[PDB]
Amino acid sequence: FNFCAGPAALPDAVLQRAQAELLDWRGKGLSVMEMSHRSDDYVAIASKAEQDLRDLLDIPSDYKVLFLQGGASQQFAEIPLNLLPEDGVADYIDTGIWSKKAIEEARRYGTVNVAASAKEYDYFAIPGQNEWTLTKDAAYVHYASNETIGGLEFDWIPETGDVPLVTDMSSDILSRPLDVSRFGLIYAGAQKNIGPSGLVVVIVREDLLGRARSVCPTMLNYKTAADNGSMYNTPATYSWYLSGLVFEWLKEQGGVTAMEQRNRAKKDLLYKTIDASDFYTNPIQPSARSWMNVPFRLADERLDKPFLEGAEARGLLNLKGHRSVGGMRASIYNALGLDAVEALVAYMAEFEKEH
Amino acid sequence: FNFCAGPAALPDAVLQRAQAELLDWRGKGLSVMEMSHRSDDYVAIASKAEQDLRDLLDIPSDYKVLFLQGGASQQFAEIPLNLLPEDGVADYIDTGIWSKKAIEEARRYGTVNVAASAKEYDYFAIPGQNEWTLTKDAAYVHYASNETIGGLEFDWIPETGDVPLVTDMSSDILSRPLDVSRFGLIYAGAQKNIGPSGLVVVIVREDLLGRARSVCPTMLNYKTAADNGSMYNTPATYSWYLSGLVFEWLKEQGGVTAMEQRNRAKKDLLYKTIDASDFYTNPIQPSARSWMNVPFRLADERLDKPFLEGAEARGLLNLKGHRSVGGMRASIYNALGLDAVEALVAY
Ligand SMILES: N[C@@H](CCC(=O)O)C(=O)O
Hints:
Catalytic activity (chain B): O-phospho-L-serine + 2-oxoglutarate = 3-phosphooxypyruvate + L-glutamate; 4-(phosphooxy)-L-threonine + 2-oxoglutarate = (R)-3-hydroxy-2-oxo-4-phosphooxybutanoate + L-glutamate
Bound molecules: glutamic acid
Strand content of chain A: 15-25%
Subcellular location (chain B): Cytoplasm
EC number (chain B): 2.6.1.52
Strand order of the largest sheet of chain A: 1-9-8-7-4-2-3
Oligomer: homodimer
Number of domains of chain A: 2
Largest sheet of chain A: 7 strands, mixed
Structural class of chain A: alpha/beta
Radius of gyration of chain A: 21 Å
Binding site for pyridoxal 5'-phosphate (chain B): 72-73, 98, 148, 168, 191, 233-234
CATH architecture of the largest domain in chain A: 3-Layer(aba) Sandwich
CATH topology of the largest domain in chain A: Aspartate Aminotransferase, domain 2
Protein name (chain B): Phosphoserine aminotransferase
Number of helices of chain A: 9
Largest interface: A-B, 55 and 57 residues
Helix content of chain A: 25-40%
Shape of chain A: globular
Distance between the termini of chain A: 24 Å
């Protein structure tokens, strides 16, 4: 039971599958690691991963789906490099640490307008859109769907008229249905629900491609990736394959509709437990409580060490909160079942009783 | 038996170890795939990978060793972005496809002087340095030590004074001893002679860092990966771990001197076969014949189909040449034993 915020737990079945065929994929005598990315076998693996992702999220045909490298952090530069004209303005929304890192990298490429900030609510809530100061002809509006450390998540899709929406969904993509047509670009570092580290998925409106500024590297150009099936150069071949295994696994589990029902029940159970007493606390207003990342603290912080030691004594790993916040944090991505949250909540009850 | 140009086959010992501990690395109930890069277990893996590499090539202490993403191609932009002042000049050496790709990308960031071209020699030979037109005040000199497609390789190191040497060693790194101190920057896509795709190794003089131009992305700034142990953000954790297994394996095999002895054998054996008859042809002059990639044409190109068939028949796979090349090519990287070249010369 691995509650780590990222890289995240992979489903057992996915790792078992990758393991069983690691030396000899489909009896061909080759690891997927040993495959040329231009071989028929690898092309079919890659094309199927792309298609399975379109199927999962019902991605419209006028979106490109890219499998890139460099982590979500590299997108903080790739987005304005591709989508922000040199004299333009980008709107950014600040809801915590990751949306602030995106902001900082964009300033190096042009003018950023920070159109809203959760600091007015001490990051316990997201400012409603009526408080936003959007720029009329902004090149795009950027926000982080889910702040992994802060446990703060959009339940809703911002209305921005004709300005393309751009969203970091690294930590909650594929956790529930998603109306992709609302967005100009969706991206996700894979190490939460998609899969293996390094890999990044970018889902982008075709009509937004082709305007990368001249200083954008070829390898950071969306149109170049799109035009070459994410194989302009050598891709992260094993990582791309693994994410394919995850997409297949997701489909067999009942897709994003099923993840929604499961993730809602998981999130409800843990929040119910925390809200029950004043021994555990989560200060995030219900309207923006993340389904994926659940920070909480104990009333008496002197009990942190015992809590974590006991948690590790049970099978409940990596509940330690990010050092910026302290306390605890249960990350409960797609790969974690209700049994995981059941076991956590059972220990939390046992612990409260003794203390 | 895998004569593929990329990626290299991985040593069976490595893949078997990777398979055995994919779910439960050293009894911790955890996949390396699921380890945080900030965790102590993964920190030790990554440090040991770095250190083993440093040992393997005898990298001096004033070199940073970076584990990056995005393929060797991405270095075509990262190099000028970090090492080429906007008001400056870079010398590039053209010996074939990959060194020309590197040139074309560089031109987007400043002035590029192509100081030498194998064009005059139909890429059958490398122009000696006295034919070169180096720029005295150059930020660096870039060349590819091994042109993977063309079988064209340097056996000598350019002497460029106080101008930094920047070299693409994707296909030949770790195949022979290397005098790292001669270079400003070495980079290598891991897929070619190490095995893991995506990952890139960059080996760069400390004193070259810190001068990247304002438009350089944070994630493509060498100083950034250098000051953060290649972990400013999440690295390609699995590929890094894999490459570490390969480094461990290389030490067990006698390291890089032992690789040199083995590769010279494989190289010399295949080349002996081709120079024996008029049946096969390699046009590359002996002085620049690659040890790593060995292209050869058939006297009757209309008989190339039964060359391949009888090869797919036997164990010998992936011998067809690049779309642009036309013919055959064998890649005899480190993980390929003499028995493979033995097997090949027979059929
Ligand atoms: N084999 C599981 C871990 C099992 C456990 O310790 O709970 C995994 O790595 O996904």
